[PDB]
Amino acid sequence: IVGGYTCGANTVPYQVSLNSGYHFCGGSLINSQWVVSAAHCYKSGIQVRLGEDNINVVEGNEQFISASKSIVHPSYNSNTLNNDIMLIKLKSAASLNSRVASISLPTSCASAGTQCLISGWGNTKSSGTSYPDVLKCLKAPILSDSSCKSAYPGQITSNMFCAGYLEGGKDSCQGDSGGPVVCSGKLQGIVSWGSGCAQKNKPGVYTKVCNYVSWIKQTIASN
Ligand SMILES: N=C(N)c1ccc(Br)cc1
Numbered sequence: 001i002v003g004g005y006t007c008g009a010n011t012v013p014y015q016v017s018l019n020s021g022y023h024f025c026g027g028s029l030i031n032s033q034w035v036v037s038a039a040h041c042y043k044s045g046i047q048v049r050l051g052e053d054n055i056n057v058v059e060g061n062e063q064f065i066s067a068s069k070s071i072v073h074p075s076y077n078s079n080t081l082n083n084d085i086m087l088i089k090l091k092s093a094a095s096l097n098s099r100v101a102s103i104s105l106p107t108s109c110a111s112a113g114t115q116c117l118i119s120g121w122g123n124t125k126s127s128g129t130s131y132p133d134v135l136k137c138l139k140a141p142i143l144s145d146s147s148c149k150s151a152y153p154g155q156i157t158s159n160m161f162c163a164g165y166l167e168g169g170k171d172s173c174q175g176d177s178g179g180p181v182v183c184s185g186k187l188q189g190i191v192s193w194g195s196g197c198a199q200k201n202k203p204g205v206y207t208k209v210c211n212y213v214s215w216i217k218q219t220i221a222s223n
């Protein structure tokens with residue numbers, strides 16, 4: 001997160017860190033057994049880390065649970081990033097509490113102009129790299145479809161939306177991949193892509209979760 005703020009420990013209790021020896025992506029806990037992340041975060045050997053604030057220190061509220069299965073969306077296209085969503089099943093159910101809590105899926109698609117909360121442990125610099133160890137947060141509005149397509153002509157599908165600031169300076173970034181965009185208390189987006197981070201006229205692009213609720217619900221019901 002570039003240009004954001006330190007959230008405060010466990011104030012984003014649905015935020016997870018995906019660890020394969022190191023933190024490599026975020027995700028969102030949607031019930032005690034399932035995490036939503038980006039398809040571009042797929043790899044083997046995933047451990048889901050819940051209740052995290054500082055990802056380099058065991059502070060006492062964490063739960064570390066190996067993934068038993070990952071399910072990348074059948075239509076994910078890694079060239080265009082269309083359908084950039086994946087489900088991760090936990091080997092055992094998380095113990096839900098005030099610091100580890102699920103986030104609801106949307107029932108409708110959020111509107112342009114809605115202020116959302118984006119969070120993660122990604123790079124905090126728009127040039128160079130610095131990785132924070134505590135969770136960072138960013139308030140960002142959903143941008144109009146017209147502005148999004150003007151920023152990325154020929155690249156925005158109906159399964160994507162832009163959020164952030166066209167003037168730059170505030171954005172998600174590498175390492176935030178797969179983490180939540182929460183609007184009106186529900187999971188509306190997944191950190192997906194963007195040209196650089198926090199660059200002028202290059203806002204963040206996010207998977208449009210409201211288009212995947214049927215697939216999520218049916219997949220969870222059978223796995
Ligand atoms: N929002 C962005 N600018 C962005 C986020 C994650 C990755 Br990976 C690349 C770009």
Ligand SMILES: [Ca+2]
Nearest residue numbers: 054057058059
């Ligand atoms: Ca920790």
